[PDB]
Swiss-Prot record:
Substrate binds at K142, N168, E197. The keyword Disulfide bond does not apply. This is Catechol O-methyltransferase. The gene is Comt. Residues 1-213 are extracellular. Its EC number is 2.1.1.6. S-adenosyl-L-methionine binds at V40, E62, S70, E88, I89, G115, A116, S117, Q118, D139. Belongs to the class I-like SAM-binding methyltransferase superfamily. Cation-dependent O-methyltransferase family. GO terms for molecular function: catechol O-methyltransferase activity; magnesium ion binding. The chain holds residues 46 to 258 of 264 of the full protein. One of its GO terms (cellular component) is vesicle. One of its GO terms (biological process) is norepinephrine metabolic process. Catalyzes the O-methylation, and thereby the inactivation, of catecholamine neurotransmitters and catechol hormones. Also shortens the biological half-lives of certain neuroactive drugs, like L-DOPA, alpha-methyl DOPA and isoproterenol.
Amino acid sequence: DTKEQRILRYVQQNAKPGDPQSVLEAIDTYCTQKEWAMNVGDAKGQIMDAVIREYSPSLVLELGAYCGYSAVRMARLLQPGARLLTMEINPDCAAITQQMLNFAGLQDKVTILNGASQDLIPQLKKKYDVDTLDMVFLDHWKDRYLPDTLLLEKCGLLRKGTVLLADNVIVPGTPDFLAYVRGSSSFECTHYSSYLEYMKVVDGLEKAIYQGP
Ligand SMILES: Nc1ncnc2c1ncn2[C@@H]1O[C@H](CSCC[C@H](N)C(=O)O)[C@@H](O)[C@H]1O
Ligand SMILES: O=c1[nH]cnc2c(O)cc(-c3ccc(F)cc3)cc12
Ligand SMILES: [Mg+2]
């Protein structure tokens, strides 16, 4: 019995099938009352919700699925026919995320890709039929944020206006990524100060909009 299985079982027993809002509320209750987990959370999730409503992305890429919290969160706001691709290196988590999405009834909007982002990003054009991305949510491992941003650019997956949204730019913190996008004339950056999920600890999200070569 892992924490991630306990979160899924809690949702299965305390949320309504096909209601993504009740799924998000059950995860937030479990993680506030029972066991902390590294879901984006309601505080930062509200900022994500606002950004998704602004840009109404047709194709979103998420790096780091975990239990599926942010996937449900973004997927429930996507337009009919819009898609999310989420990459998850840990197969146990991949499987928890698939079941989470199935229960929320969002499985037809989301494809979970198994593997390291650094292995799958180069496969997106040919293996997964991707042209360019409208939005990327970076929330996997801090040390991958900058190399994966640079890899997405190299692979031609970024276009003018592509919205990169990065979780945890303050805690655990992504200093090289932040220094890079903020100093780069290829990105327009905005910081959204907030709180670490379920904690009274300052964190934030960085929005960096790609401006071209
Ligand atoms: N290189 C990599 N590629 C893909 N996934 C990775 C990765 N390094 C870490 N991960 C995964 O990223 C996750 C971090 S937690 C992700 C939280 C999720 N976005 C949410 O808010 O609900 C973990 O599940 C971990 O397995
Ligand atoms: O490693 C992480 N990947 C993605 N998101 C995370 C996230 O939101 C929080 C944390 C985290 C924060 C504080 C702490 F004390 C221990 C872990 C890690 C990740
Ligand atoms: Mg995070």
